[PDB]
Amino acid sequence: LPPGWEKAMSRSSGRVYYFNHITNASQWERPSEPARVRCSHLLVKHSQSRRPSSWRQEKITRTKEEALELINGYIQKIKSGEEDFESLASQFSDCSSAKARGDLGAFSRGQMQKPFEDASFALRTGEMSGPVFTDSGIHIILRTE
Numbered sequence: 001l002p003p004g005w006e007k008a009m010s011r012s013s014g015r016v017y018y019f020n021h022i023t024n025a026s027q028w029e030r031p032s033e034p035a036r037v038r039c040s041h042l043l044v045k046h047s048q049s050r051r052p053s054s055w056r057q058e059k060i061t062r063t064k065e066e067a068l069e070l071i072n073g074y075i076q077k078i079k080s081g082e083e084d085f086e087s088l089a090s091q092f093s094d095c096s097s098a099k100a101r102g103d104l105g106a107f108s109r110g111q112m113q114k115p116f117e118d119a120s121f122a123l124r125t126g127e128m129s130g131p132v133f134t135d136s137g138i139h140i141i142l143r144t145e
């Protein structure tokens with residue numbers, strides 16, 4: 001397997017799947033570095049975020065567990081096609097980039113917080129992360145370039 005990826009076993013179904021411990025992505029199919037990458041993200045802040053405030057809420061009070069539940073729900077809606085990433089980012093991201101559909105632009109290594117950077121550079125073009133934790137909160141990352 002590529003680095004970052006491991007085989008895993010579904011607990012409910014017994015079917016093999018693949019999990020990436022850098023991006024927290026999981027998928028059924030077997031998976032198959034850039035100077036810069038371009039990503040969008042959807043951030044859900046919690047009461048332990050470095051700045052527990054956002055354009056959505058002056059005082060963010062949800063627990064980290066509650067933030068993760070929200071992230072997990074958004075991931076479900078994106079993967080089912082019931083909702084688009086860009087739509088959910090514009091509506092519900094606690095980052096100011098919500099107004100740009102979550103787009104952060106292009107960036108190099110050494111600019112972003114490290115778990116976010118590592119996830120971004122491990123994603124393939126077009127691929128989306130699982131929940132990624134930083135001091136800002138919990139992110140869904142979409143690599144666009």
Ligand SMILES: CCNS(=O)(=O)c1ccc(F)cc1
Pocket residue numbers: 096097098099100103104105
């Ligand atoms: C700075 C220009 N406004 S923005 O909303 O596109 C934005 C906000 C935060 C970012 F980290 C990146 C882009």
